Ligand binder design. Sequence first.
Ligand SMILES: N#Cc1cc(Cl)cc(Oc2c(Br)ccc(CC(=O)Nc3ccc(S(N)(=O)=O)cc3Cl)c2F)c1
Lengths: 416, 556
Amino acid sequence: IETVPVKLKPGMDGPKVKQWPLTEEKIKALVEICTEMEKEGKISKIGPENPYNTPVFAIKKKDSTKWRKLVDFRELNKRTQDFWEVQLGIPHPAGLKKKKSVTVLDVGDAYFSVPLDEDFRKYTAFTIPSINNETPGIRYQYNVLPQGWKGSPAIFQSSMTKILEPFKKQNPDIVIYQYMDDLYVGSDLEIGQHRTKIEELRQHLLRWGLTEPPFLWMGYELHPDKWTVQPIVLPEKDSWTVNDIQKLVGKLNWASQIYPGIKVRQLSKLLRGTKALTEVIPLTEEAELELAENREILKEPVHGVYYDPSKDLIAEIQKQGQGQWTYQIYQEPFKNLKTGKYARMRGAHTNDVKQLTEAVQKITTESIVIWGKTPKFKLPIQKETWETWWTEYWQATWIPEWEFVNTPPLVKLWYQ
Amino acid sequence: MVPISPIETVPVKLKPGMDGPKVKQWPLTEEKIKALVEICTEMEKEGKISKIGPENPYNTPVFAIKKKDSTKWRKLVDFRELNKRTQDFWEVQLGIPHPAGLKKKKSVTVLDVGDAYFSVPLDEDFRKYTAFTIPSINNETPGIRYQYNVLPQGWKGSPAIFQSSMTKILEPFAAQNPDIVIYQYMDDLYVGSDLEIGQHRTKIEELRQHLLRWGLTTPDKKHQKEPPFLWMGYELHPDKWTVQPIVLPEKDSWTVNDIQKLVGKLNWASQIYPGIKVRQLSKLLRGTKALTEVIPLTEEAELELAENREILKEPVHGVYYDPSKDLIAEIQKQGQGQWTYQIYQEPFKNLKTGKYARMRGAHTNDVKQLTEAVQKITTESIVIWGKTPKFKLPIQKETWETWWTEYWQATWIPEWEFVNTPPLVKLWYQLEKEPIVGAETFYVDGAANRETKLGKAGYVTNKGRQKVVPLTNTTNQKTELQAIYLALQDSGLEVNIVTDSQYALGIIQAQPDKSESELVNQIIEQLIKKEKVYLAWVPAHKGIGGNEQVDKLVSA
Ligand SMILES: N#Cc1cc(Cl)cc(Oc2c(Br)ccc(CC(=O)Nc3ccc(S(N)(=O)=O)cc3Cl)c2F)c1
């Protein structure tokens, strides 16, 4: 019934972020959604004495056909006091990533039952804009804990604990983890049963429900031991052309920045002449051993690679063509903590930006499961193209950080 | 007495830590003080200000300014200090409507609520902070002290508090009149409807009544300003819009601030006047802010102007928006990184027009530029009409497909069609994905001495063809490009080229069609002539030979 004292950090003000342009149909959706939250007390109109703004928009979650309000709280989150007071944190469950299966559940509606600090409310301010600036923006602040705010899970943590203990002690093999508006449920079971254990975990939340949520009935399916980092692999051929050997030496030289004793002297030897690129070169005996050796070296781990929860995760993405995308997550260049590929990206066979947007979501999800935090993306796209279109294809209730690559990597190949 | 509803007050506060103002009252003439005392009496007699005791330690200076040939003073309070100490307010007037966004209505009425501005009370706890002093004649009595009971002219909060208050009052009227539109812009109200002008002046009358409930009246003599309304540099007519007259200074000498006027006014015109160009004119404002420097024109800037004045010669009109008709956007390539566009619903009737200029870069291509102009027009259109237009673009379906599928970045343009209006955006060359069978292999290398700027560029080929050219006034980067240029110059129509230059790959893999580097352009011009080029990269200093048999010849 009673709130929790929340503040900003030292000398930082509340967010003052420009609201970006919205289509008429997303404006209509937000007018209907916000008009109802107001009747239910979740939000209240505000006057011009509140100078704070956070951007707002409307998505359709995976398989639904009803609009959802998404608030881009990235700026409030950066500025929101770290919640270490009682607990040093949620010591990330290293077990979650080993489970055969992990189901992701939107428990976001839970938060709207808990009220917000009275003092803090002004910082949750957002604007439903009007077309052509014809009417002033419809201005609102939160009364209850908002979806997408970092404080929402931290405040609700105690409440979430007391809703879970029955199930967690009923099923002690199940791993359960909360990031933002999302609950992540892992097990070592077969699917039919897993699907059962999920449906059961809804009957708990529906029971604490009365004491119809709109997006609480949905379930996403991962396989984090059916994930794989990727070895570097070299071709196996009977016939090498000069071109084939130039590309091998290129990839081995690149690989040499990651791995110690990768040698190219004996294969480079083969490339000394001014030969036609399509001409076949028999490998020498030293060249065949150097190649065999390099293979051996690539079938091992990278040496001295560790996670560091003090440092940023960085995620790089290359467009490989034909709907295929490569990625790598690191903190130190050449120390990859995860690498990956995506070939099948959904129903976007002629839309590069929809594909990049799905890849960023999938990479961000993997990142939540492994380290319980989102990485900083380096997107192979112009800022203005990305900032025009990403919100049309976005389905998640979190939003990571990103920057733009403007110079084409040579490396794309070395992962092709 | 008919009970008028009071206007609920907006809680106001000073910045966190900052206190109110204490500025010395300026010494005034006897003439001026008399003028103020009369005004401040009439203001006090209306409810707007009030006399305060001496405990109030807050002073905002006051002045009297004479209206041009009006033997009559008006009162000016210099709030510039109190503003700096007043909290921030949400500002919604960042953006103003665009006339092309307006839906045409049979009847539109403009009402200015000129009186109603002071009708809005200030926050009780904040009044004390608005204190000003009328100094007495000869400074022999203590000056008459006053505080505001209403929003002052020239205060930080008055714009924002006025609008929030007008909006709150209008809400029920709009709600219960869906068949009319009211647009609030600063102190004005614009009222439109598709109703017979009987049913319309009726609904206008009701809105005067509804504004009376909060004790606000509007002119009996119906506003002297009638169509065309002159608003924010535009002209609004019943059936069309345009900008207010654009006259270009004819002159003998063109100076600096007289081009920071010719840009702004040519850009303003470009939203309806199709094919304005400002590039050769914005070229002159490069760097130098010496605001009275005569800069000579270029011979490209006198023919771009004889285009401007022939476009500005006869007036052009935009139409208003019809939500039931489709939204089309069409783009033309003008040259020198310049693009022009029209947005329309019906052939030859433009809602509006505009231009896009190439972003500052070393290297560029036409398809990237077209992509950027599409995104500019997409966002602009979302702002004005709440939707993306269908595009008509001078690029073939097959060109675009080759481009996006082979481009290393992710790219997208929304729904569009080819329009065959030269010049067509095209791909000028395409690099092979595989080495070419029976094409000569040129192994190229260049290097320069960091101290002497002396270097060499050349090649050895699989046929024993060779060249080394000595160069002066060069760098490693320039020699690496020149080597590639010599192979292109000296090979047949199909050719394989091996370089160790990460620099040259970087530029060529970005597919420039145009460059500021004259050496990159020459490379582009050879690539255009070739039937097939394959560019292979090998790492340096591995004595990849022809990169070793030519790193030892070019470092000699
Ligand atoms: N000043 C001003 C102003 C500014 C804006 Cl942004 C809008 C505005 O009124 C409207 C409105 Br409300 C709605 C549509 C338009 C465009 C339009 O239909 N204009 C128009 C429509 C009708 C008449 S009539 N027949 O009453 O003389 C006159 C005009 Cl200028 C308007 F010009 C007036």
